Amino acid sequence: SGFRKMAFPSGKVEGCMVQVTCGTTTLNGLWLDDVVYCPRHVICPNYEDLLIRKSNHNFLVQAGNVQLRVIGHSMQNCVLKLKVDTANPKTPKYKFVRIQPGQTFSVLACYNGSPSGVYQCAMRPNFTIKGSFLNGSCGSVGFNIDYDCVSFCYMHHMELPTGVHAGTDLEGNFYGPFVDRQTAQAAGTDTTITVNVLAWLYAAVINGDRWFLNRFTTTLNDFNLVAMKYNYEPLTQDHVDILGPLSAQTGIAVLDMCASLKELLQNGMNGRTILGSALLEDEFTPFDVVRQCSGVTF
Amino acid sequence: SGFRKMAFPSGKVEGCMVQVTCGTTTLNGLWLDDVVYCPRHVICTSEDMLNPNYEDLLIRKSNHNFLVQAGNVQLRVIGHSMQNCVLKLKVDTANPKTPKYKFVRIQPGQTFSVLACYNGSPSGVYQCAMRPNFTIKGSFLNGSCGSVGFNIDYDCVSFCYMHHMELPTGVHAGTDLEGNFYGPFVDRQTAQAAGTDTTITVNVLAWLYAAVINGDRWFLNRFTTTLNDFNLVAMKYNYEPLTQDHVDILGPLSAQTGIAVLDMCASLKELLQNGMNGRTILGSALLEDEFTPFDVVRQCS
Ligand SMILES: O=C(Cc1cccc(Cl)c1)Nc1cnccc1C(F)(F)F
Ligand SMILES: [Cl-]
C-alpha cells in the first residue's frame, strides 16, 4: 500500500553528469561514450557564428575531479555535442527518445555537474514542465528506465516567467514553441492530462479509496464536452484502450470512471481527499500506476 | 523557481542493494563493507510472526542457510549476528561500491528518501517524512522489506530507516540501521495500530516560507500571535505543538523573507480557520508538512 510520486533510481544517470564551462557560463553536460551533450546556450544569438569562434580548449569539461579534454565539437539543433578523448566507463545502455505531452519522466537536477536531487514530472500539454530548478541547473536531464536501458527524453534549457521550465529532447529539438534566447516567451494556457487523472483514480481504487465511485456511466462524446469545459485534455479511444488493464483489475469500466471524474469536476471533493490530495492529480500515467501497483524493478 | 518533493540521487544506495533469502522468505539487504544488514524477520516463517523467538530461530541457522545475491553474484555468508531487529550478515566480499556513510537515528518531522526495492533490485525513489506517530506514509508492496531510507549530505549517505512492515492502515513501520524500531512497534504480526497522526507544524511553516520565497504571499495577514495561543489553536486541528526549538530553527527563513515566525504562525492559524478558498500554495490545495526547514533552505536557495 501507499502511492507516492516516484522517480526512477537515478544511479545510471548520475554516472553521466559532468560540468561544462565556456567563458563565464557553467552548466551541466551528459557524458555518454566519448560525447558530452549540453545546451548550446553555454557558448552565449547566431549560434553558428558564436561556435565557429570557439576552439576545443575553450570548453572546460569536468567529470568529478577529473578534467576531460575536448577534441571536437558540433551542434545538433539546440544541443552542443562535445567530443571528448575519454569514453565514459559508466555509460549505461541508453536511447534518446522524444516524449509526448502527458508522458512522465524523472529529472536528475544538477548544479556544477553534481546531482542534487531527483523528482518525477510530466511533460505538460503546453510542453512545459513544472520542475524545480535554480541557476546552474541547465543541462539537467529527464529520463525513464525500461529494464536496463535509460531513455533520455529531456534536457533543461530555461525557465519561463511563470516559474515553469522549457527544454529539448537529447537531439536538441525543443518541446513547445520555445527558442533558446532571452526574449518574450510565455507558456501557453495549460490543460489537465485527463488519461493521467483517470489512471490516478484507478490507483486510488486499488489503494481502497472508493467514495468517488458512482453507478453511472457516460459516452466518450458527453465526457469530452464536460472535460473541454474544465480545461481537461480530450480523452481519445487510445486513452480508453490504454486504461483497459486498470479497468479489468478494478472492475470499473473506463467510461464508468469518466462518470466519477465528471461528478468531481462538477461538484468538487466536498472536503474529502483522494490519495491524500484535495486536487485531481495528473502526473501519473496509466503505466506509472501499473508499475507502482506491481513493483517493477531496474 | 518551482518547488518539488525532491528525493536525493539514489545511485550511492543502489550500489548497496542485495537480495537476502532465508528458506522461503526473500527480502532486501544493505551491503556496506563486508556486512549485509537486513530485517531479522527474514528468518521467520508466516506461522512464526505471531510470537517469534528470534534468538531461538537464529541459533538454529548456519551461515549457508542465508543466500545473499548482489546482482548475478552470490555472496558467501561467513558470520551472522543480531543487533536489535536487524540481522547483520558477515560476507566474504567487501562492497567495492560502498559509499561514505553514517547510521543516523532521525526524529519525527525529519524527511528522507526511500529507495524502494524488490529482490535486491531498486524500482523507485521517493521522498518521505517520519510522521509524529513514528510511521511513514510510504509506497511499498510485498518483498519491499529491507528497503532503506537515507539522506545525502555532500558525499556521505546517512542511512536512517530500514523498512520492516506495513500496518493495517496502509502506513509503514521500520527501524534505524541499528535495528531499533521507530515508535512502539514490534516485528510481530500482533495487533498493532499507528497512533493518531498529527501535522508537522514546523514543516508546514517552512513550506509557507518556501511559498513566500517563490512569490506567493496571499495567505499572510497583519496579525501576530504568542507561541501559547498558536499552540492552543494548532492542537484543535491535530497539529503538533510548535516549540521554541522550532521557532529558533525557522530563524534563517524568517530573516530571509522578513516575516517573523509568530507572524507566519498567525497566517497558519488563519489558513486553518479559512481553508484556501479555491487557491493553492506552491501548487497544493492542502498544507504540506513533508518539507523541513533544512529542505526548504536546500531547494529554494
Ligand atoms: O508487512 C509485511 C511483512 C510483515 C508482516 C508482519 C510483521 C512484519 Cl515485521 C512483517 N510486508 C509488507 C511490507 N511493506 C508493504 C507491504 C507488505 C505486505 F504485507 F503487503 F506484504
Ligand atoms: Cl532528525
Side-chain angles (χ1 to χ4, degrees):
Chain A
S1 311
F3 205 67
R4 283 275 184 185
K5 187 76 54 107
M6 205 172 286
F8 281 100
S10 58
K12 284 171 170 53
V13 178
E14 289 169 55
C16 303
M17 305 308 309
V18 302
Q19 178 194 77
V20 180
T21 302
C22 198
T24 194
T25 306
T26 285
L27 46 65
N28 312 283
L30 187 67
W31 181 29
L32 294 169
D33 300 310
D34 55 357
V35 175
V36 172
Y37 302 82
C38 77
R40 81 180 170 168
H41 69 75
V42 73
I43 73 183
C44 297
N46 188 314
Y47 289 100
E48 174 192 6
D49 191 62
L50 290 176
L51 191 55
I52 202 60
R53 305 169 186 265
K54 300 272 172 172
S55 79
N56 292 321
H57 277 226
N58 293 147
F59 299 102
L60 308 178
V61 177
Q62 216 185 295
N65 266 72
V66 184
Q67 206 187 290
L68 302 181
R69 41 167 292 108
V70 173
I71 59 164
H73 58 269
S74 75
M75 184 173 287
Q76 178 180 14
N77 302 308
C78 305
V79 153
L80 177 67
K81 304 193 293 195
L82 299 175
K83 196 67 154 171
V84 296
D85 77 329
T86 312
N88 188 1
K90 296 169 171 186
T91 303
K93 256 195 61 189
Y94 77 93
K95 288 164 175 135
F96 283 171
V97 308
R98 185 171 175 91
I99 60 163
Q100 296 297 310
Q103 295 194 296
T104 59
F105 55 102
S106 303
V107 176
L108 182 64
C110 304
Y111 298 91
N112 304 294
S114 161
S116 62
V118 59
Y119 60 87
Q120 187 75 359
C121 69
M123 176 59 63
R124 302 306 309 169
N126 71 359
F127 292 99
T128 70
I129 75 169
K130 287 171 167 178
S132 179
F133 291 122
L134 301 182
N135 175 42
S137 60
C138 298
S140 293
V141 297
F143 63 98
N144 287 286
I145 308 189
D146 3 272
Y147 303 90
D148 56 332
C149 185
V150 181
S151 300
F152 293 107
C153 63
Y154 178 83
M155 173 169 275
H156 186 58
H157 279 246
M158 64 195 206
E159 185 172 290
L160 295 175
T162 51
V164 305
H165 306 97
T168 67
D169 54 30
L170 267 289
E171 294 181 292
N173 303 294
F174 259 95
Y175 285 99
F178 305 115
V179 296
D180 51 358
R181 66 172 137 104
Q182 186 55 65
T183 200
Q185 306 197 69
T189 289
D190 204 25
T191 54
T192 298
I193 311 158
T194 317
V195 63
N196 285 7
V197 174
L198 288 169
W200 171 86
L201 289 179
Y202 278 112
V205 173
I206 288 163
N207 286 260
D209 246 313
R210 298 175 76 91
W211 66 258
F212 52 86
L213 307 176
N214 67 21
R215 66 162 58 234
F216 302 112
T217 194
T218 186
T219 67
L220 190 57
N221 299 353
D222 284 352
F223 176 77
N224 277 322
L225 297 163
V226 168
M228 179 179 276
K229 183 191 142 157
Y230 293 90
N231 262 47
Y232 264 59
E233 273 299 287
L235 193 77
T236 66
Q237 187 51 69
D238 195 40
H239 294 144
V240 173
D241 292 346
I242 288 168
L243 292 163
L246 290 170
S247 172
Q249 183 190 332
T250 66
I252 302 162
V254 177
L255 293 170
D256 174 355
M257 194 60 93
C258 284
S260 283
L261 184 52
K262 176 215 301 158
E263 301 314 314
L264 296 171
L265 294 179
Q266 294 170 343
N267 301 276
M269 295 212 191
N270 308 339
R272 282 169 297 195
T273 57
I274 296 168
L275 293 171
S277 182
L279 288 177
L280 298 175
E281 182 71 42
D282 73 346
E283 300 212 351
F284 293 96
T285 70
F287 294 128
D288 291 347
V289 168
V290 163
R291 199 172 304 123
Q292 202 184 143
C293 307
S294 83
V296 172
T297 64
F298 317 92
Chain B
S1 317
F3 205 74
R4 282 276 189 179
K5 188 141 284 192
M6 207 172 291
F8 282 99
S10 60
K12 285 170 173 63
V13 179
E14 290 169 53
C16 302
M17 305 309 308
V18 302
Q19 178 193 78
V20 181
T21 302
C22 188
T24 190
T25 306
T26 284
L27 46 65
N28 312 282
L30 187 67
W31 181 27
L32 294 169
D33 299 312
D34 56 356
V35 176
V36 171
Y37 302 81
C38 77
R40 68 179 176 171
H41 70 75
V42 73
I43 73 185
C44 298
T45 75
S46 299
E47 48 101 22
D48 249 328
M49 287 310 306
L50 286 171
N51 291 290
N53 188 314
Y54 291 99
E55 173 193 6
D56 192 64
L57 290 175
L58 191 56
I59 200 63
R60 306 170 185 269
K61 301 272 170 167
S62 64
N63 295 330
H64 54 279
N65 294 146
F66 298 103
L67 308 178
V68 177
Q69 216 187 295
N72 266 72
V73 184
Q74 206 189 289
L75 302 181
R76 189 168 72 98
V77 172
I78 58 164
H80 59 269
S81 76
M82 184 169 61
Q83 175 181 16
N84 305 303
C85 306
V86 305
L87 179 66
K88 304 193 292 193
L89 299 176
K90 194 68 145 177
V91 296
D92 211 36
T93 309
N95 187 0
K97 296 180 187 170
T98 296
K100 255 195 60 190
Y101 77 92
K102 289 166 174 199
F103 284 171
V104 177
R105 183 173 175 89
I106 60 165
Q107 296 298 311
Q110 185 60 266
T111 65
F112 55 101
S113 304
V114 177
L115 183 63
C117 302
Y118 298 91
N119 303 294
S121 287
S123 62
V125 60
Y126 60 87
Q127 189 72 353
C128 241
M130 179 61 56
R131 301 307 309 169
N133 71 359
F134 293 98
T135 70
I136 75 159
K137 287 174 166 176
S139 173
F140 291 123
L141 301 182
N142 179 275
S144 61
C145 298
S147 293
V148 297
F150 63 98
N151 288 286
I152 308 182
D153 307 283
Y154 297 85
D155 58 332
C156 188
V157 185
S158 34
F159 294 106
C160 62
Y161 178 84
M162 174 169 274
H163 185 54
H164 276 67
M165 65 193 205
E166 185 172 290
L167 295 174
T169 50
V171 304
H172 306 97
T175 72
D176 54 30
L177 268 289
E178 295 182 294
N180 299 119
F181 258 95
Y182 285 101
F185 306 113
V186 291
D187 50 359
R188 256 173 98 199
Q189 240 307 136
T190 215
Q192 304 193 72
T196 71
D197 204 27
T198 54
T199 298
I200 310 158
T201 315
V202 65
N203 283 8
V204 174
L205 288 170
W207 172 86
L208 290 177
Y209 277 112
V212 173
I213 288 163
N214 286 48
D216 245 313
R217 297 177 50 104
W218 69 260
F219 46 86
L220 304 177
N221 67 19
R222 63 176 194 101
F223 302 112
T224 192
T225 187
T226 68
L227 187 58
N228 206 38
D229 284 353
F230 174 77
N231 284 324
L232 286 175
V233 170
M235 262 81 121
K236 303 165 180 182
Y237 295 95
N238 261 46
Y239 264 59
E240 270 301 286
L242 192 77
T243 65
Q244 188 51 230
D245 266 15
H246 295 143
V247 173
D248 292 346
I249 289 168
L250 293 163
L253 290 170
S254 172
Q256 185 190 330
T257 66
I259 302 164
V261 178
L262 292 171
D263 279 18
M264 194 60 91
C265 284
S267 319
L268 182 51
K269 275 163 78 179
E270 184 169 283
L271 281 170
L272 294 178
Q273 168 189 273
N274 294 346
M276 295 209 194
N277 198 5
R279 282 171 293 208
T280 58
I281 295 170
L282 292 172
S284 181
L286 287 179
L287 299 178
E288 297 293 316
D289 75 346
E290 299 211 349
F291 297 106
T292 70
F294 185 98
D295 292 348
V296 168
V297 165
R298 191 170 189 271
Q299 181 176 180
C300 297
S301 312

Short mmCIF file of all heavy atoms in Angstrom, two decimals, chain A residues 88-131:
data_model
loop_
_atom_site.label_atom_id
_atom_site.label_comp_id
_atom_site.label_asym_id
_atom_site.label_seq_id
_atom_site.Cartn_x
_atom_site.Cartn_y
_atom_site.Cartn_z
N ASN A 88 33.09 7.46 -21.46
CA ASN A 88 32.61 7.31 -20.09
C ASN A 88 32.52 5.85 -19.78
O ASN A 88 31.70 5.17 -20.38
CB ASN A 88 31.24 7.98 -19.94
CG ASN A 88 30.75 8.05 -18.51
OD1 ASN A 88 31.43 7.63 -17.57
ND2 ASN A 88 29.56 8.57 -18.32
N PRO A 89 33.34 5.36 -18.84
CA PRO A 89 33.25 3.93 -18.48
C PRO A 89 31.93 3.58 -17.77
O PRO A 89 31.55 2.41 -17.71
CB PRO A 89 34.47 3.73 -17.57
CG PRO A 89 34.73 5.07 -16.98
CD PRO A 89 34.34 6.07 -18.02
N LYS A 90 31.24 4.58 -17.23
CA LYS A 90 29.94 4.40 -16.59
C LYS A 90 28.78 4.56 -17.58
O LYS A 90 27.64 4.63 -17.14
CB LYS A 90 29.77 5.39 -15.42
CG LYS A 90 30.76 5.18 -14.27
CD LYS A 90 30.70 6.34 -13.29
CE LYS A 90 31.50 6.05 -12.04
NZ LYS A 90 31.32 7.11 -11.01
N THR A 91 29.03 4.60 -18.91
CA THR A 91 27.94 4.75 -19.89
C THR A 91 26.93 3.60 -19.77
O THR A 91 27.32 2.44 -19.90
CB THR A 91 28.48 4.84 -21.33
OG1 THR A 91 29.41 5.93 -21.41
CG2 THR A 91 27.37 5.03 -22.36
N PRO A 92 25.67 3.88 -19.42
CA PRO A 92 24.70 2.78 -19.35
C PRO A 92 24.19 2.45 -20.75
O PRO A 92 24.43 3.18 -21.71
CB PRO A 92 23.58 3.38 -18.50
CG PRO A 92 23.60 4.82 -18.86
CD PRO A 92 25.02 5.18 -19.20
N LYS A 93 23.36 1.39 -20.85
CA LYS A 93 22.63 1.10 -22.08
C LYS A 93 21.60 2.26 -22.18
O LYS A 93 20.96 2.57 -21.18
CB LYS A 93 21.85 -0.21 -21.94
CG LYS A 93 22.49 -1.39 -22.67
CD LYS A 93 21.50 -2.56 -22.79
CE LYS A 93 20.25 -2.18 -23.58
NZ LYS A 93 19.20 -3.24 -23.52
N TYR A 94 21.57 2.97 -23.31
CA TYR A 94 20.69 4.13 -23.43
C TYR A 94 20.13 4.32 -24.84
O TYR A 94 20.65 3.77 -25.80
CB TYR A 94 21.39 5.43 -22.94
CG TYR A 94 22.39 5.98 -23.93
CD1 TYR A 94 22.01 6.94 -24.86
CD2 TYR A 94 23.70 5.52 -23.97
CE1 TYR A 94 22.91 7.41 -25.81
CE2 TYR A 94 24.61 6.00 -24.90
CZ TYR A 94 24.21 6.94 -25.83
OH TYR A 94 25.10 7.41 -26.76
N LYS A 95 19.07 5.13 -24.92
CA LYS A 95 18.39 5.58 -26.13
C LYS A 95 18.06 7.05 -25.93
O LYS A 95 17.83 7.49 -24.81
CB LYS A 95 17.02 4.88 -26.29
CG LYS A 95 17.03 3.43 -26.66
CD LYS A 95 15.63 2.85 -26.39
CE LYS A 95 15.54 1.40 -26.87
NZ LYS A 95 14.87 0.49 -25.88
N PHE A 96 17.94 7.79 -27.04
CA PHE A 96 17.43 9.15 -26.99
C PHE A 96 16.01 9.02 -27.51
O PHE A 96 15.81 8.52 -28.63
CB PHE A 96 18.25 10.08 -27.90
CG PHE A 96 19.60 10.53 -27.37
CD1 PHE A 96 20.48 11.22 -28.18
CD2 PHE A 96 19.97 10.26 -26.07
CE1 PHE A 96 21.70 11.65 -27.69
CE2 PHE A 96 21.21 10.67 -25.60
CZ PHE A 96 22.06 11.37 -26.41
N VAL A 97 15.02 9.36 -26.70
CA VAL A 97 13.62 9.25 -27.11
C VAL A 97 12.92 10.59 -26.95
O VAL A 97 13.25 11.35 -26.03
CB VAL A 97 12.88 8.14 -26.33
CG1 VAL A 97 13.65 6.82 -26.40
CG2 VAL A 97 12.65 8.57 -24.90
N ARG A 98 12.00 10.90 -27.84
CA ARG A 98 11.23 12.13 -27.72
C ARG A 98 9.88 11.73 -27.12
O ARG A 98 9.25 10.80 -27.62
CB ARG A 98 11.06 12.83 -29.07
CG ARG A 98 10.34 14.18 -28.90
CD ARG A 98 10.33 15.00 -30.15
NE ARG A 98 9.53 16.21 -29.96
CZ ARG A 98 10.02 17.38 -29.54
NH1 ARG A 98 11.30 17.49 -29.23
NH2 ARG A 98 9.22 18.43 -29.41
N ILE A 99 9.48 12.35 -26.01
CA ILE A 99 8.21 12.01 -25.37
C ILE A 99 7.05 12.91 -25.82
O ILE A 99 7.25 13.96 -26.42
CB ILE A 99 8.35 11.98 -23.84
CG1 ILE A 99 8.79 13.35 -23.32
CG2 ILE A 99 9.27 10.83 -23.41
CD1 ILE A 99 8.57 13.49 -21.93
N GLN A 100 5.82 12.48 -25.54
CA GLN A 100 4.63 13.24 -25.88
C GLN A 100 4.10 13.94 -24.64
O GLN A 100 4.32 13.45 -23.54
CB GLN A 100 3.56 12.27 -26.43
CG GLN A 100 3.98 11.59 -27.73
CD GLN A 100 4.16 12.61 -28.82
OE1 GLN A 100 3.27 13.45 -29.04
NE2 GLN A 100 5.32 12.58 -29.51
N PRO A 101 3.34 15.05 -24.77
CA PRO A 101 2.72 15.65 -23.57
C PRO A 101 1.84 14.62 -22.84
O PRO A 101 1.24 13.77 -23.48
CB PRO A 101 1.85 16.78 -24.12
CG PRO A 101 2.37 17.04 -25.47
CD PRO A 101 2.94 15.77 -26.00
N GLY A 102 1.85 14.66 -21.52
CA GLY A 102 1.14 13.68 -20.72
C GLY A 102 2.06 12.57 -20.24
O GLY A 102 1.78 11.92 -19.23
N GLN A 103 3.15 12.32 -20.97
CA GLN A 103 4.10 11.28 -20.56
C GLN A 103 4.93 11.83 -19.41
O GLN A 103 5.14 13.04 -19.32
CB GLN A 103 4.97 10.78 -21.74
CG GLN A 103 4.16 10.06 -22.83
CD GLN A 103 5.02 9.27 -23.83
OE1 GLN A 103 5.82 9.83 -24.57
NE2 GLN A 103 4.86 7.95 -23.88
N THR A 104 5.35 10.96 -18.50
CA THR A 104 6.13 11.39 -17.34
C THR A 104 7.59 10.91 -17.44
O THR A 104 7.91 10.00 -18.22
CB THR A 104 5.48 10.86 -16.07
OG1 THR A 104 5.45 9.45 -16.17
CG2 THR A 104 4.10 11.44 -15.83
N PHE A 105 8.46 11.50 -16.61
CA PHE A 105 9.86 11.15 -16.58
C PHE A 105 10.48 11.65 -15.28
O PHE A 105 9.93 12.53 -14.62
CB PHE A 105 10.59 11.73 -17.78
CG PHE A 105 10.46 13.23 -17.98
CD1 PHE A 105 11.47 14.09 -17.62
CD2 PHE A 105 9.33 13.78 -18.56
CE1 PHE A 105 11.38 15.45 -17.85
CE2 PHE A 105 9.22 15.15 -18.77
CZ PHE A 105 10.25 15.98 -18.43
N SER A 106 11.65 11.13 -14.97
CA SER A 106 12.39 11.56 -13.79
C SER A 106 13.42 12.57 -14.20
O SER A 106 13.97 12.49 -15.28
CB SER A 106 13.11 10.37 -13.16
OG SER A 106 12.13 9.39 -12.87
N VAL A 107 13.68 13.54 -13.34
CA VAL A 107 14.66 14.56 -13.62
C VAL A 107 15.71 14.50 -12.55
O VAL A 107 15.39 14.58 -11.38
CB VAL A 107 14.02 15.96 -13.64
CG1 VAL A 107 15.09 17.03 -13.84
CG2 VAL A 107 12.94 16.06 -14.72
N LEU A 108 16.95 14.43 -12.94
CA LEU A 108 18.06 14.47 -12.02
C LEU A 108 18.56 15.90 -12.05
O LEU A 108 19.26 16.28 -12.99
CB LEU A 108 19.16 13.49 -12.46
CG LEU A 108 20.34 13.41 -11.53
CD1 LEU A 108 19.92 12.87 -10.16
CD2 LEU A 108 21.42 12.55 -12.12
N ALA A 109 18.13 16.71 -11.09
CA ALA A 109 18.53 18.12 -11.04
C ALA A 109 20.00 18.18 -10.60
O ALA A 109 20.38 17.50 -9.65
CB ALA A 109 17.64 18.87 -10.07
N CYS A 110 20.84 18.90 -11.35
CA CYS A 110 22.28 19.01 -11.13
C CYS A 110 22.74 20.44 -11.13
O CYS A 110 22.19 21.27 -11.85
CB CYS A 110 23.07 18.23 -12.18
SG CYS A 110 22.64 16.48 -12.30
N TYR A 111 23.83 20.70 -10.40
CA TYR A 111 24.48 22.00 -10.31
C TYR A 111 25.96 21.71 -10.29
O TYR A 111 26.42 20.90 -9.47
CB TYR A 111 24.08 22.76 -9.03
CG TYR A 111 22.60 23.04 -9.00
CD1 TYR A 111 21.72 22.15 -8.41
CD2 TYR A 111 22.07 24.13 -9.69
CE1 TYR A 111 20.34 22.35 -8.48
CE2 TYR A 111 20.70 24.35 -9.74
CZ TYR A 111 19.84 23.44 -9.15
OH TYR A 111 18.49 23.66 -9.17
N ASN A 112 26.70 22.32 -11.22
CA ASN A 112 28.14 22.16 -11.35
C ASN A 112 28.54 20.71 -11.61
O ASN A 112 29.56 20.24 -11.10
CB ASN A 112 28.85 22.72 -10.11
CG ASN A 112 28.51 24.16 -9.86
OD1 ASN A 112 28.85 25.06 -10.66
ND2 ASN A 112 27.81 24.41 -8.75
N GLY A 113 27.73 20.01 -12.40
CA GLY A 113 27.95 18.61 -12.74
C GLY A 113 27.74 17.64 -11.60
O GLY A 113 28.10 16.46 -11.72
N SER A 114 27.18 18.12 -10.48
CA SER A 114 26.90 17.31 -9.30
C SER A 114 25.39 17.17 -9.10
O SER A 114 24.68 18.16 -8.90
CB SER A 114 27.56 17.93 -8.08
OG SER A 114 27.00 17.47 -6.86
N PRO A 115 24.88 15.93 -9.12
CA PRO A 115 23.45 15.72 -8.92
C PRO A 115 23.05 16.09 -7.50
O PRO A 115 23.75 15.75 -6.54
CB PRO A 115 23.27 14.22 -9.18
CG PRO A 115 24.50 13.82 -10.00
CD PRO A 115 25.58 14.65 -9.37
N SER A 116 21.95 16.83 -7.37
CA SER A 116 21.49 17.27 -6.07
C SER A 116 20.14 16.68 -5.69
O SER A 116 19.85 16.59 -4.50
CB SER A 116 21.43 18.79 -6.00
OG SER A 116 20.50 19.28 -6.96
N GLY A 117 19.34 16.27 -6.67
CA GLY A 117 18.04 15.72 -6.38
C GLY A 117 17.39 15.03 -7.55
O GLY A 117 17.81 15.20 -8.68
N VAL A 118 16.37 14.26 -7.28
CA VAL A 118 15.65 13.56 -8.31
C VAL A 118 14.17 13.71 -8.03
O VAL A 118 13.74 13.62 -6.89
CB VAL A 118 16.12 12.08 -8.51
CG1 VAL A 118 15.96 11.25 -7.24
CG2 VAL A 118 15.40 11.42 -9.70
N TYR A 119 13.42 14.07 -9.07
CA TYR A 119 11.97 14.18 -8.92
C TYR A 119 11.26 13.69 -10.17
O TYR A 119 11.86 13.53 -11.21
CB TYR A 119 11.54 15.59 -8.47
CG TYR A 119 11.93 16.69 -9.43
CD1 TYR A 119 11.12 17.03 -10.50
CD2 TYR A 119 13.16 17.33 -9.31
CE1 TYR A 119 11.51 17.99 -11.41
CE2 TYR A 119 13.54 18.32 -10.19
CZ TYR A 119 12.71 18.65 -11.24
OH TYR A 119 13.07 19.62 -12.13
N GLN A 120 9.99 13.38 -10.04
CA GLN A 120 9.19 12.88 -11.13
C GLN A 120 8.32 14.05 -11.61
O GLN A 120 7.90 14.90 -10.83
CB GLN A 120 8.35 11.67 -10.67
CG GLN A 120 7.58 10.95 -11.76
CD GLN A 120 8.44 10.08 -12.66
OE1 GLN A 120 9.67 9.99 -12.52
NE2 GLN A 120 7.79 9.40 -13.60
N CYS A 121 8.13 14.12 -12.92
CA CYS A 121 7.31 15.17 -13.50
C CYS A 121 6.74 14.74 -14.84
O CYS A 121 7.11 13.69 -15.38
CB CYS A 121 8.09 16.48 -13.60
SG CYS A 121 9.42 16.43 -14.81
N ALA A 122 5.79 15.51 -15.34
CA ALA A 122 5.13 15.20 -16.58
C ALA A 122 5.37 16.33 -17.56
O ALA A 122 5.47 17.50 -17.17
CB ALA A 122 3.63 15.04 -16.33
N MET A 123 5.43 15.99 -18.84
CA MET A 123 5.53 16.98 -19.92
C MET A 123 4.10 17.50 -20.02
O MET A 123 3.20 16.71 -20.30
CB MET A 123 5.91 16.26 -21.22
CG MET A 123 5.95 17.14 -22.48
SD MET A 123 7.14 18.50 -22.32
CE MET A 123 8.63 17.57 -22.15
N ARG A 124 3.87 18.76 -19.66
CA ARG A 124 2.52 19.33 -19.68
C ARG A 124 2.00 19.39 -21.12
O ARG A 124 2.79 19.45 -22.07
CB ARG A 124 2.53 20.76 -19.08
CG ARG A 124 3.04 20.88 -17.63
CD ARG A 124 2.33 19.98 -16.64
NE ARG A 124 0.88 20.11 -16.74
CZ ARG A 124 0.01 19.31 -16.15
NH1 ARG A 124 0.44 18.34 -15.34
NH2 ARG A 124 -1.29 19.48 -16.33
N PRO A 125 0.67 19.42 -21.32
CA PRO A 125 0.13 19.60 -22.69
C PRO A 125 0.66 20.89 -23.37
O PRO A 125 0.73 20.95 -24.59
CB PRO A 125 -1.38 19.62 -22.46
CG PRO A 125 -1.57 18.80 -21.20
CD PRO A 125 -0.42 19.26 -20.34
N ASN A 126 1.06 21.91 -22.58
CA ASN A 126 1.63 23.15 -23.13
C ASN A 126 3.16 23.07 -23.35
O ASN A 126 3.82 24.11 -23.55
CB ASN A 126 1.27 24.38 -22.30
CG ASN A 126 1.93 24.48 -20.94
OD1 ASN A 126 2.71 23.63 -20.52
ND2 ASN A 126 1.64 25.54 -20.20
N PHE A 127 3.71 21.85 -23.27
CA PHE A 127 5.10 21.48 -23.48
C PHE A 127 6.08 22.00 -22.45
O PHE A 127 7.29 21.85 -22.65
CB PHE A 127 5.57 21.86 -24.86
CG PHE A 127 4.88 21.04 -25.93
CD1 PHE A 127 3.80 21.54 -26.63
CD2 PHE A 127 5.29 19.74 -26.19
CE1 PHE A 127 3.16 20.78 -27.59
CE2 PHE A 127 4.65 18.97 -27.15
CZ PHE A 127 3.58 19.50 -27.85
N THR A 128 5.60 22.56 -21.35
CA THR A 128 6.48 22.98 -20.28
C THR A 128 6.51 21.87 -19.21
O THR A 128 5.71 20.93 -19.24
CB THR A 128 5.98 24.30 -19.69
OG1 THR A 128 4.76 24.07 -18.98
CG2 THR A 128 5.84 25.41 -20.74
N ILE A 129 7.45 21.96 -18.29
CA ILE A 129 7.49 21.06 -17.15
C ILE A 129 7.43 21.94 -15.90
O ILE A 129 8.00 23.04 -15.85
CB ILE A 129 8.66 20.02 -17.15
CG1 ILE A 129 10.01 20.64 -16.80
CG2 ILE A 129 8.75 19.22 -18.47
CD1 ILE A 129 11.12 19.62 -16.53
N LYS A 130 6.67 21.50 -14.90
CA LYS A 130 6.59 22.22 -13.64
C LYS A 130 7.72 21.61 -12.82
O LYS A 130 7.48 20.68 -12.08
CB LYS A 130 5.22 22.02 -12.98
CG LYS A 130 4.10 22.79 -13.68
CD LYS A 130 2.71 22.43 -13.16
CE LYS A 130 1.65 23.39 -13.64
NZ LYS A 130 0.30 22.99 -13.16
N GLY A 131 8.94 22.07 -13.04
CA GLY A 131 10.10 21.50 -12.35
C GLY A 131 10.55 22.33 -11.18
O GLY A 131 9.85 23.24 -10.73
#
